Amino acid sequence: WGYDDKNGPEQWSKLYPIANGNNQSPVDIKTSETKHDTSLKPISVSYNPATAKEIINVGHSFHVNFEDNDNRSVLKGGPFSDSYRLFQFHFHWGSTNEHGSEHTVDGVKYSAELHVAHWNSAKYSSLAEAASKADGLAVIGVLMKVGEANPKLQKVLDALQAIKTKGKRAPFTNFDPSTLLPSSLDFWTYPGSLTHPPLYESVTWIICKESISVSSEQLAQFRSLLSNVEGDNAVPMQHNNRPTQPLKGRTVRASF
């Protein structure tokens, strides 16, 4: 699978059939239609800089990975009775500056999107057990708005020199990805899926209502990454965002 025209989102179904399921992400959040739910506590993020393990190039994107064998870095709060464990964060972008984000709000597409992934440390014992589970994963989504260079991006953008080709991997230590979040964690939540394959309808989505800034050049650093393996040609990572999906009667809750 991939984001190319011959293996993209459109051919995913004729491959993974859940892509035409009932709980697909990303989606468009129509604000006139959200619901303030009163049982929604705020969201508390308690990450530890020293769980920061490595950065690695997975060919369609890159990931920053964390140590996930105790609740050292947790997502607590929101719609969650349980504490969720941080294990990864990563990004999404597009061909140009006007649509790299996966979620849209009110039909407004953003330049990129930040995803911060947790699994249910406390109902399940492993993340492979957790992946298929409707209540297994929790991802925070942060819209990215083209403007000023983000300072806290740099410390990770500075690290892609060392993972330029597909499979290339580098150590990445002392990082609090909470530093990447907006000042307000006012958010929406809806039940949804993973946005690329395996596409598991197992993600409880947290979408911060506040954007963060990324600069036009920082987005270019995203596309200086290579889909290919070393020695092979250069094919750069141009986009890796899925089109929005049908809500199919799902309810998007606001925390405000």
Ligand SMILES: *CCOCCOc1cc(C(F)(F)F)cc(C(F)(F)F)c1
């Ligand atoms: C850059 C890659 O991220 C780290 C690996 O995260 C996952 C592992 C697994 C598996 F069960 F195979 F270990 C599954 C998932 C999934 F649920 F598909 F997101 C992520």
Ligand SMILES: CC(=O)Nc1nnc(S(N)(=O)=O)s1
């Ligand atoms: C290993 C891994 O993380 N696979 C994913 N598949 N879809 C994801 S999404 N866009 O929720 O963040 S992550």
Ligand SMILES: [Zn+2]
């Ligand atoms: Zn993602």
